[PDB]
Amino acid sequence: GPKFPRVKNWELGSITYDTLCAQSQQDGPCTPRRCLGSLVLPRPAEQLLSQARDFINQYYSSIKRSGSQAHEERLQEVEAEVASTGTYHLRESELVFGAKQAWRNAPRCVGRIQWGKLQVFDARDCSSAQEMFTYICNHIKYATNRGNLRSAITVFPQRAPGRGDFRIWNSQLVRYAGYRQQDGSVRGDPANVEITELCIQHGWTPGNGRFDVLPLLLQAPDEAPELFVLPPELVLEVPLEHPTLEWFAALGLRWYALPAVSNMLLEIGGLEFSAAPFSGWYMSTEIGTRNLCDPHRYNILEDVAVCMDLDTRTTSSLWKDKAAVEINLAVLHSFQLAKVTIVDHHAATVSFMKHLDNEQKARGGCPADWAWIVPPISGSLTPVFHQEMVNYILSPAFRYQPDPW
């Protein structure tokens, strides 16, 4: 057979071979002796030039001008700029291409069918924390679009020799406060205790509710971060109700419309964009299963099961499973009523299978992280459960980066 990984779908009996993994220049955490695929956190001079050349070759292939004179001239341009300055700069169209390719390359993203549809806001002229705030408000307005959500990324200036980084300190643009209590419990979102306490240390007067929207801590090169409160009318939220269980609304639960990740590094051609927040829309299990039911998050499973009058004293009643299903249904029904874009985990995984087929023909494979792609409820009820996946790192890439404090 072919000397490439053989990939099988066990539902359909079909086979493909991944030839794209051959383009991986970056090693993951696995070896012949042990598989570390389940680990969440996995572990320039002429080094820049080779990454830059590779990226420029990718750009010129995507516009089908590979080997051309415009291609050879751009390469020369890039080496001359690196030769004299130690760094280089992307053309506008190269940035747009690179940002889409970073998304298309993200092995943990189930929403990649959408990858070609991304509004890239070029904010590489930004020179203050105040201006970052203006750019971020504009992004939120555009992406929210009164509930008809639109994928977007805003790109701030790249890391530069000596000079400090542009950083957004918050992990997302919208986050609920988590307030550590006297008894050691948490009011609000326990995921956000640290960022909440940083906001207070930097002068934010804290609230005391379960769904208090945090301010943003924004850092321009070589300055302490500055605190910015989002105007409330800019942050679209959806109160949660259930279509048949009338008491569910009385629980006072809610979630924000716009998932906007702000702490990842965008790498393109060896250039590093340390502030490049990106947004799309939610898959309903992110809110209904993880955010609301993780024991270390809002942890509402027992409260909902009690309201549903389930037997919470024994595992074999399946009280957890029944409650989780209703909470996910409430999320879907409430977003739908509110006319805010959301996708259920069946529709999302079906579209991801279509994406895998598109990419098989386009590039000879698709890097995918099975543990992350399979949804956290109803795993084998979705087609992705039955699909083998090959995980590898391609650049352009979204990467984790250390916290700025």
Ligand X SMILES: N=C(Nc1cccc(CO[C@@H](CN)COCc2cccc(/N=C(/N)c3cccs3)c2)c1)c1cccs1
Ligand Y SMILES: C[C@H](O)[C@H](O)[C@H]1CNc2nc(N)[nH]c(=O)c2N1
Q: In Å, how far are 267, 371, 372 from 6, measured between CA atoms?
A: 29, 19, 21
Q: Is 108 a catalytic residue?
A: no
From the list Zn ion, ligand X, ligand Y, none, pick the one residue 35 interacts with, judged by a Cβ distance below 5 to 8 Å according to partner type: Zn ion
Please identify, using beta-carbon distances, which residue of 225 and 280 lies nearer to ligand HEM: 280
Q: Which does 247 bind (CB under 5 to 8 A by kind): ligand Y, ligand X, Zn ion, none?
A: none
Q: Classify residue 107 by its DSSP letter.
A: T
Query: Contact between 40 and ligand Y (CB under 6 A)?
Result: yes
Q: Among 303, 385, 401, 404, indicate the residue that binds ligand Y (CB under 6 A).
A: 385
Q: How many Å apart are CA 405 and CA 224, to the nearest integer?
A: 10
Closest CA to 166 of 193, 131, 137: 131
* Stretch in the footprint of a copy of itself (CB under 8 A) among 80-88, 163-171, 200-208, 340-348: 340-348
Alpha carbon distances (Å) from 8 to 2, 15, 34, 351: 14, 5, 22, 18
59 assigned binding-site residue = no
Closest separation in Å from C-beta 172 to Zn ion: 29
261 binds ligand X (CB under 6 A): yes
Strand ranges for 189-333 from DSSP E: 216-219, 226-228, 237-239, 254-256, 260-261, 265-268, 271-273, 278-279
Distance of CA 232 to the CA centre of its chain: 23
Which tokens sit at 357? 């087929």
Are 264 and 400 in contact, with CB atoms under 8 Å apart? yes
Q: How far is the CB of 107 from ligand Y (least distance, A)?
A: 11
**Element housing 16 (H / E):** strand 15-17
Whose tokens are 């109803």? That residue is 378
Tokens of 167: 């950083």
Interacting residues with ligand Y between 228 and 247 (CB under 6 A): none
With 0-12 CB in 10 A as exposed, 13-18 as middle and 19+ as buried, what is 230? Answer: middle
| Distance of closest approach, residue 3 Cβ to ligand Y, in angstroms | 20
179 bridge partner residues: 187
Catalytic residue among 112, 159, 167, 175: 112
x/- map, 375-404, ligand X, by CB under 6 A: -------------------------x-xx-
Q: Is 277 in the site for ligand HEM (CB under 6 A)?
A: no
Is 109 among the residues known to form the active site? yes
User: What are the start-end ranges of the E strands in 44-173?
Assistant: 119-122, 152-155, 167-168
C-alpha–C-alpha distance, residues 380 and 169, integer Å? 37
Pairing outcome for strands 15-17 and 265-268: unpaired
Nearest CB to a copy of itself, comparing residues 54 and 122: 54
Part in contact with a copy of itself (CB under 8 A); list of ranges 68-76, 194-202, 264-272, 292-300 = 292-300
Amino acid at 191: A
247 is catalytic: no
Q: How far is the CB of 309 from a copy of itself (least distance, A)?
A: 12
Q: Is residue 213 within the footprint of a copy of itself (CB under 8 A)?
A: no
Helix (H, G, I), strand (E, B) or coil at 174: coil
In the range 288-327, which residues lie near ligand X by CB under 6 A? none
Residue 187 to residue 192: CA distance in whole angstroms: 10
Alpha-carbon distance 149 to 344, whole Å?
15
281 belongs to an annotated ligand binding site: yes
First to last CA, the chain: 51
371 is in an annotated binding site: yes
Residues whose CB is less than 8 angstroms from the CB of residue 182 and which lie 6 or more positions away in sequence, other chains included: none
Pick the stretch among 12-20, 175-183, 259-267, 382-390 that binds ligand Y (CB under 6 A).
Answer: 382-390
Interaction between residue 14 and ligand Y (CB under 6 A): no
Told to check if 371 binds ligand Y by CB under 6 A, we report yes
Residue 351 interacts with, from a copy of itself, Zn ion, ligand Y, none (CB under 5-8 Å by kind):
none
Residue 371 contact among ligand X, ligand Y, Zn ion, none, beta carbon within 5 to 8 Å by kind: ligand Y
Residues of the binding site for Zn(2+): 30, 35
Residues that bind ligand HEM (CB under 6 A): 103, 106, 108-111, 114, 118, 151, 153, 278, 280-281, 283, 286, 343, 348, 372, 398
Query: Which residues are known catalytic residues?
Result: 109, 112, 281, 286
Residues that bind ligand Y (CB under 6 A): 10, 38, 40, 371-372, 385-388
Residues of the binding site for heme b: 109, 400
Residues that bind a copy of itself (CB under 8 A): 5-8, 10-12, 18, 21, 24, 27-41, 43, 289-290, 293-296, 301, 315-318, 320-322, 324-325, 328-329, 332, 336, 344, 346-347, 350, 369-371, 374-381, 385-386, 388-392
